[PDB]
Short mmCIF file of N, CA and C and ligand atoms in Angstrom, two decimals:
data_model
loop_
_atom_site.label_atom_id
_atom_site.label_comp_id
_atom_site.label_asym_id
_atom_site.label_seq_id
_atom_site.Cartn_x
_atom_site.Cartn_y
_atom_site.Cartn_z
N UNK W 155 0.64 -1.43 0.25
CA UNK W 155 -0.20 -0.05 0.24
C UNK W 155 0.88 1.42 0.12
N UNK W 156 0.50 2.29 -0.76
CA UNK W 156 1.44 3.43 -0.49
C UNK W 156 1.01 4.24 0.60
N UNK W 157 2.33 4.66 1.08
CA UNK W 157 2.38 5.31 1.98
C UNK W 157 3.10 6.74 2.05
N UNK W 158 2.93 7.81 3.03
CA UNK W 158 3.45 9.12 2.99
C UNK W 158 4.81 9.14 3.58
N UNK W 159 5.48 10.46 3.64
CA UNK W 159 6.36 10.77 4.17
C UNK W 159 5.94 11.09 5.86
N UNK W 160 7.13 10.56 6.57
CA UNK W 160 6.75 11.00 7.76
C UNK W 160 6.91 12.69 8.50
N UNK W 161 7.75 13.34 7.81
CA UNK W 161 7.90 14.56 8.28
C UNK W 161 8.52 14.81 9.21
N UNK W 162 9.36 13.81 9.79
CA UNK W 162 10.40 14.42 11.29
C UNK W 162 11.61 13.57 11.17
N UNK W 163 12.04 13.08 10.12
CA UNK W 163 13.19 12.62 9.84
C UNK W 163 14.40 13.41 9.15
N UNK W 164 15.50 13.20 9.32
CA UNK W 164 16.66 13.90 8.70
C UNK W 164 16.11 14.45 7.42
N UNK W 165 15.84 13.15 6.55
CA UNK W 165 15.76 13.35 4.87
C UNK W 165 14.18 14.40 4.83
N UNK W 166 13.24 13.71 5.36
CA UNK W 166 11.96 14.75 4.98
C UNK W 166 12.13 16.64 5.56
N UNK W 167 12.99 16.49 7.01
CA UNK W 167 13.16 18.12 7.25
C UNK W 167 13.98 18.83 6.27
N UNK W 168 15.03 18.00 5.74
CA UNK W 168 15.93 19.11 5.17
C UNK W 168 15.58 19.87 3.66
N UNK W 169 15.89 20.76 3.32
CA UNK W 169 15.43 21.31 2.33
C UNK W 169 15.72 20.46 0.88
N UNK W 170 15.52 20.82 -0.10
CA UNK W 170 15.64 20.11 -1.47
C UNK W 170 16.82 20.91 -1.78
N UNK W 171 17.81 19.75 -2.44
CA UNK W 171 19.19 20.40 -2.73
C UNK W 171 19.34 21.62 -3.69
N UNK W 172 18.64 21.67 -4.84
CA UNK W 172 18.53 21.78 -5.73
C UNK W 172 19.48 21.59 -6.66
N UNK W 173 20.26 20.37 -6.73
CA UNK W 173 21.49 20.01 -7.65
C UNK W 173 21.08 18.62 -8.37
N UNK W 174 20.34 17.56 -7.44
CA UNK W 174 20.29 16.60 -8.41
C UNK W 174 19.02 16.48 -9.28
N UNK W 175 18.95 15.61 -10.55
CA UNK W 175 18.21 15.74 -11.65
C UNK W 175 16.94 15.76 -11.46
N UNK W 176 16.20 15.26 -10.20
CA UNK W 176 15.23 15.59 -9.89
C UNK W 176 14.74 17.15 -9.55
N UNK W 177 15.54 17.81 -8.41
CA UNK W 177 15.59 18.97 -8.12
C UNK W 177 15.50 20.05 -9.42
N UNK W 178 16.37 19.63 -10.22
CA UNK W 178 16.95 20.87 -11.64
C UNK W 178 15.72 20.47 -12.53
N UNK W 179 14.59 19.39 -12.46
CA UNK W 179 13.78 19.49 -13.04
C UNK W 179 12.31 20.54 -12.38
N UNK W 180 12.31 20.42 -11.20
CA UNK W 180 11.05 21.10 -10.52
C UNK W 180 10.88 22.57 -11.01
N UNK W 181 9.91 23.20 -11.63
CA UNK W 181 9.71 24.60 -11.74
C UNK W 181 10.48 25.22 -10.68
N UNK W 182 10.37 25.21 -9.28
CA UNK W 182 10.76 25.75 -8.22
C UNK W 182 12.38 26.27 -8.55
N UNK W 183 13.20 25.42 -8.94
CA UNK W 183 14.31 25.54 -9.84
C UNK W 183 14.95 25.86 -10.68
N UNK W 184 13.79 26.30 -11.46
CA UNK W 184 13.59 26.71 -12.91
C UNK W 184 13.42 25.59 -14.21
N UNK W 185 13.27 24.36 -13.85
CA UNK W 185 12.93 23.44 -14.77
C UNK W 185 11.71 23.27 -15.17
N UNK W 186 11.05 22.43 -16.43
CA UNK W 186 9.93 22.26 -16.97
C UNK W 186 9.10 21.33 -15.99
N UNK W 187 9.47 20.73 -14.90
CA UNK W 187 8.49 20.51 -13.87
C UNK W 187 7.89 18.85 -14.69
N UNK W 188 8.50 17.74 -15.50
CA UNK W 188 8.09 16.90 -16.23
C UNK W 188 8.30 15.65 -15.52
N UNK W 189 9.38 15.77 -14.79
CA UNK W 189 9.90 14.13 -13.75
C UNK W 189 8.82 13.94 -12.46
N UNK W 190 8.67 15.30 -11.98
CA UNK W 190 7.81 14.90 -10.99
C UNK W 190 8.37 14.23 -9.98
N UNK W 191 9.58 14.13 -9.45
CA UNK W 191 9.94 13.13 -8.63
C UNK W 191 10.62 14.16 -7.40
N UNK W 192 10.63 13.55 -6.22
CA UNK W 192 11.37 14.22 -4.99
C UNK W 192 12.52 14.34 -5.39
N UNK W 193 13.38 15.34 -4.53
CA UNK W 193 14.66 15.41 -4.39
C UNK W 193 15.10 14.21 -3.78
N UNK W 194 16.45 13.55 -4.43
CA UNK W 194 16.81 12.33 -3.90
C UNK W 194 17.44 12.52 -2.57
N UNK W 195 17.60 13.83 -2.17
CA UNK W 195 18.06 13.61 -0.59
C UNK W 195 16.88 13.63 0.54
N UNK W 196 15.77 13.80 0.01
CA UNK W 196 14.49 13.99 0.68
C UNK W 196 13.60 12.46 0.45
N UNK W 197 14.69 11.31 0.44
CA UNK W 197 13.78 10.08 0.29
C UNK W 197 13.46 9.64 2.06
N UNK W 198 12.13 9.53 2.59
CA UNK W 198 11.58 9.23 3.75
C UNK W 198 12.52 8.20 4.44
N UNK W 199 12.90 7.99 5.42
CA UNK W 199 13.48 6.94 6.39
C UNK W 199 12.24 5.91 6.65
N UNK W 200 11.60 6.21 6.99
CA UNK W 200 10.15 5.69 7.46
C UNK W 200 8.71 6.21 7.31
N UNK W 201 8.05 5.66 6.17
CA UNK W 201 7.22 6.07 6.07
C UNK W 201 5.80 5.75 6.53
N UNK W 202 4.92 6.72 6.43
CA UNK W 202 3.82 6.05 7.58
C UNK W 202 2.58 5.83 6.69
N UNK W 203 1.32 5.38 6.99
CA UNK W 203 0.11 5.30 6.58
C UNK W 203 -0.28 6.86 6.26
N UNK W 204 -1.19 6.28 5.08
CA UNK W 204 -1.70 8.03 5.10
C UNK W 204 -3.23 8.18 5.87
N UNK W 205 -3.11 9.24 6.22
CA UNK W 205 -4.22 10.03 7.10
C UNK W 205 -5.67 9.16 7.29
N UNK W 206 -5.86 8.80 6.00
CA UNK W 206 -7.26 7.81 5.58
C UNK W 206 -7.34 6.71 6.11
N UNK W 207 -6.41 5.98 6.47
CA UNK W 207 -5.89 4.56 6.53
C UNK W 207 -6.92 4.45 8.01
N UNK W 208 -7.49 3.03 7.79
CA UNK W 208 -8.64 2.90 9.03
C UNK W 208 -8.00 1.07 8.57
N UNK W 209 -8.57 0.18 10.06
CA UNK W 209 -9.10 -1.05 10.27
C UNK W 209 -9.83 -1.33 9.34
N UNK W 210 -9.85 -2.52 8.64
CA UNK W 210 -10.56 -3.32 7.64
C UNK W 210 -11.93 -3.95 8.17
N UNK W 211 -11.57 -3.91 9.55
CA UNK W 211 -12.55 -4.40 10.61
C UNK W 211 -13.94 -3.71 10.76
N UNK W 212 -13.37 -2.94 11.89
CA UNK W 212 -13.97 -1.79 12.22
C UNK W 212 -13.89 -0.45 11.96
N UNK W 213 -13.14 -0.16 10.74
CA UNK W 213 -13.41 1.21 10.02
C UNK W 213 -12.89 2.43 10.88
N UNK W 214 -12.30 2.05 11.91
CA UNK W 214 -11.81 3.20 12.81
C UNK W 214 -10.37 3.39 12.37
N UNK W 215 -9.75 4.62 12.86
CA UNK W 215 -8.34 4.80 12.65
C UNK W 215 -7.55 4.45 13.82
N UNK W 216 -6.19 4.84 14.28
CA UNK W 216 -5.32 4.34 15.20
C UNK W 216 -5.80 4.99 16.57
N UNK W 217 -6.05 4.10 17.57
CA UNK W 217 -6.28 4.62 18.72
C UNK W 217 -5.40 4.41 20.08
N UNK W 218 -4.42 4.04 19.65
CA UNK W 218 -3.31 3.81 21.08
C UNK W 218 -2.99 5.04 21.69
N UNK W 219 -3.12 6.13 21.75
CA UNK W 219 -3.23 6.99 22.53
C UNK W 219 -4.01 7.24 23.59
N UNK W 220 -5.28 6.48 23.32
CA UNK W 220 -6.47 6.69 24.25
C UNK W 220 -6.44 5.70 25.27
N UNK W 221 -5.38 4.64 25.17
CA UNK W 221 -5.25 3.58 26.09
C UNK W 221 -3.67 3.49 26.56
N UNK W 222 -3.55 3.20 27.79
CA UNK W 222 -2.24 3.40 28.66
C UNK W 222 -1.51 1.85 28.75
N UNK W 223 -2.18 1.06 29.15
CA UNK W 223 -1.67 -0.45 29.14
C UNK W 223 -1.10 -0.55 27.94
N UNK W 224 0.24 -1.31 27.97
CA UNK W 224 0.70 -1.69 26.95
C UNK W 224 0.11 -2.30 25.92
N UNK W 225 -0.29 -3.46 26.06
CA UNK W 225 -1.06 -4.66 25.24
C UNK W 225 -2.29 -3.90 24.68
N UNK W 226 -3.00 -3.25 25.50
CA UNK W 226 -4.25 -2.60 24.87
C UNK W 226 -3.90 -1.29 23.90
N UNK W 227 -2.78 -0.95 23.94
CA UNK W 227 -2.26 0.50 23.12
C UNK W 227 -1.82 -0.34 22.06
N UNK W 228 -1.13 -1.33 21.73
CA UNK W 228 -0.55 -2.18 20.96
C UNK W 228 -1.89 -2.59 19.78
N UNK W 229 -2.86 -3.12 20.74
CA UNK W 229 -3.98 -3.85 19.75
C UNK W 229 -5.04 -2.65 19.38
N UNK W 230 -5.02 -1.39 19.48
CA UNK W 230 -5.55 -0.09 18.99
C UNK W 230 -4.77 0.57 17.81
N UNK W 231 -3.40 0.00 17.61
CA UNK W 231 -2.70 0.49 16.65
C UNK W 231 -2.99 -0.02 15.23
N UNK W 232 -3.64 0.82 14.38
CA UNK W 232 -3.07 0.48 12.96
C UNK W 232 -2.09 -0.68 12.41
N UNK W 233 -2.41 -1.86 11.96
CA UNK W 233 -0.63 -2.32 11.40
C UNK W 233 -1.32 -2.96 10.17
N UNK W 234 -0.37 -2.69 9.18
CA UNK W 234 -0.40 -3.08 7.93
C UNK W 234 0.44 -4.45 7.66
N UNK W 235 0.11 -5.64 7.08
CA UNK W 235 0.64 -6.59 7.00
C UNK W 235 1.78 -6.77 5.88
N UNK W 236 2.94 -6.76 5.78
CA UNK W 236 4.06 -6.41 4.67
C UNK W 236 3.81 -7.68 3.60
N UNK W 237 2.95 -8.92 4.19
CA UNK W 237 2.39 -9.91 2.91
C UNK W 237 1.17 -9.77 2.26
N UNK W 238 0.16 -9.41 3.24
CA UNK W 238 -1.27 -9.72 2.51
C UNK W 238 -1.55 -8.01 2.46
N UNK W 239 -0.98 -7.28 3.18
CA UNK W 239 -1.48 -5.60 2.82
C UNK W 239 -2.40 -5.37 3.45
N UNK W 240 -2.89 -6.12 4.22
CA UNK W 240 -4.36 -5.50 5.31
C UNK W 240 -3.84 -4.60 5.77
N UNK W 241 -4.64 -3.74 6.46
CA UNK W 241 -4.36 -2.78 7.66
C UNK W 241 -5.48 -3.16 8.69
N UNK W 242 -5.05 -3.32 10.18
CA UNK W 242 -5.99 -3.80 11.00
C UNK W 242 -5.45 -3.40 12.33
N UNK W 243 -6.43 -3.41 13.17
CA UNK W 243 -6.40 -3.01 14.57
C UNK W 243 -5.79 -4.57 15.00
N UNK W 244 -4.67 -4.90 15.82
CA UNK W 244 -4.57 -6.29 16.06
C UNK W 244 -5.60 -6.81 16.80
N UNK W 245 -6.26 -5.78 18.14
CA UNK W 245 -7.25 -6.41 18.85
C UNK W 245 -8.53 -6.91 18.14
N UNK W 246 -8.85 -6.07 16.80
CA UNK W 246 -9.73 -6.57 16.00
C UNK W 246 -9.81 -7.92 15.34
N UNK W 247 -8.59 -8.69 15.44
CA UNK W 247 -8.25 -9.68 14.86
C UNK W 247 -8.52 -11.08 16.04
N UNK W 248 -9.30 -11.72 16.06
CA UNK W 248 -8.76 -13.00 17.18
C UNK W 248 -8.69 -14.41 16.27
N UNK W 249 -7.64 -15.07 16.44
CA UNK W 249 -6.72 -15.96 15.90
C UNK W 249 -6.32 -16.91 16.81
N UNK W 250 -6.75 -18.20 16.80
CA UNK W 250 -5.92 -19.37 17.77
C UNK W 250 -4.56 -19.58 17.52
N UNK W 251 -4.41 -20.24 16.21
CA UNK W 251 -2.88 -21.06 15.95
C UNK W 251 -2.07 -19.99 15.42
N UNK W 252 -2.40 -18.52 15.65
CA UNK W 252 -1.05 -17.71 15.33
C UNK W 252 -0.83 -16.42 15.79
N UNK W 253 -0.23 -15.61 16.19
CA UNK W 253 -0.01 -14.47 16.45
C UNK W 253 0.87 -13.48 14.97
N UNK W 254 0.81 -12.04 15.27
CA UNK W 254 1.66 -11.62 14.25
C UNK W 254 2.97 -11.16 14.67
N UNK W 255 3.80 -10.63 13.82
CA UNK W 255 5.32 -10.47 13.92
C UNK W 255 5.33 -9.24 13.91
N UNK W 256 5.64 -8.17 14.95
CA UNK W 256 5.89 -6.78 14.41
C UNK W 256 7.47 -6.21 13.68
N UNK W 257 7.42 -5.43 12.73
CA UNK W 257 8.53 -5.28 12.11
C UNK W 257 8.92 -3.92 13.01
N UNK W 258 10.17 -3.53 13.44
CA UNK W 258 10.19 -2.39 14.31
C UNK W 258 11.20 -1.42 13.13
N UNK W 259 11.85 -1.62 12.09
CA UNK W 259 12.18 -1.02 11.52
C UNK W 259 11.19 0.32 10.61
N UNK W 260 9.64 -0.62 10.34
CA UNK W 260 9.25 0.61 9.68
C UNK W 260 7.80 0.43 10.86
N UNK W 261 7.05 2.03 11.07
CA UNK W 261 5.66 2.19 11.34
C UNK W 261 5.04 1.00 11.01
N UNK W 262 4.01 0.63 12.09
CA UNK W 262 2.85 0.22 11.85
C UNK W 262 2.85 -0.97 11.02
N UNK W 263 3.76 -1.74 10.94
CA UNK W 263 4.17 -2.70 10.25
C UNK W 263 4.24 -4.13 10.44
N UNK W 264 3.62 -5.04 10.37
CA UNK W 264 3.80 -6.31 10.65
C UNK W 264 3.91 -7.54 9.63
N UNK W 265 3.87 -8.84 10.15
CA UNK W 265 3.36 -9.80 9.35
C UNK W 265 2.32 -10.17 10.45
N UNK W 266 0.57 -9.99 9.69
CA UNK W 266 -0.29 -10.14 10.64
C UNK W 266 -0.47 -12.08 10.95
N UNK W 267 -1.42 -12.49 11.82
CA UNK W 267 -1.52 -13.73 12.20
C UNK W 267 -1.94 -14.60 11.00
N UNK W 268 -2.80 -14.29 10.09
CA UNK W 268 -3.16 -14.92 8.83
C UNK W 268 -2.07 -15.29 8.04
N UNK W 269 -1.02 -14.83 7.80
CA UNK W 269 0.26 -15.14 7.13
C UNK W 269 1.72 -15.48 7.69
N UNK W 270 1.55 -15.64 9.17
CA UNK W 270 2.61 -15.85 9.78
C UNK W 270 2.46 -17.23 10.15
ZN1 ZN O 232 17.59 17.54 -4.59
ZN1 ZN O 233 10.19 10.77 7.32
ZN1 ZN O 234 -10.49 -2.25 14.50
ZN1 ZN O 235 -1.19 -11.01 6.16
#
């Protein structure tokens, strides 16, 4: 699934370099604006789900901030499966024979219980 830049990492915060083949193409640098790519120095390190992302079961967004207990917090996070690409709250899925495996390098990312 398509994701958006996090807007908080070194790459996202830094200004466009004005020198790479993509900056040179941008109108703001006097180019024709045909390639339409981002500056090569601004490739987000940890892209996040889009603001419209919701759980495929309950149709709600992340609610991890409303809960303080760690298990409950995790279960109200949106998690996207890296294998089947479903976005869900882990608490909206009950499976006996499997649990999911969280990926710590990307936000809201796991292999869900259906795929693991
Ligand atoms: Zn650039
Ligand atoms: Zn970023
Ligand atoms: Zn849900
Ligand atoms: Zn899955």
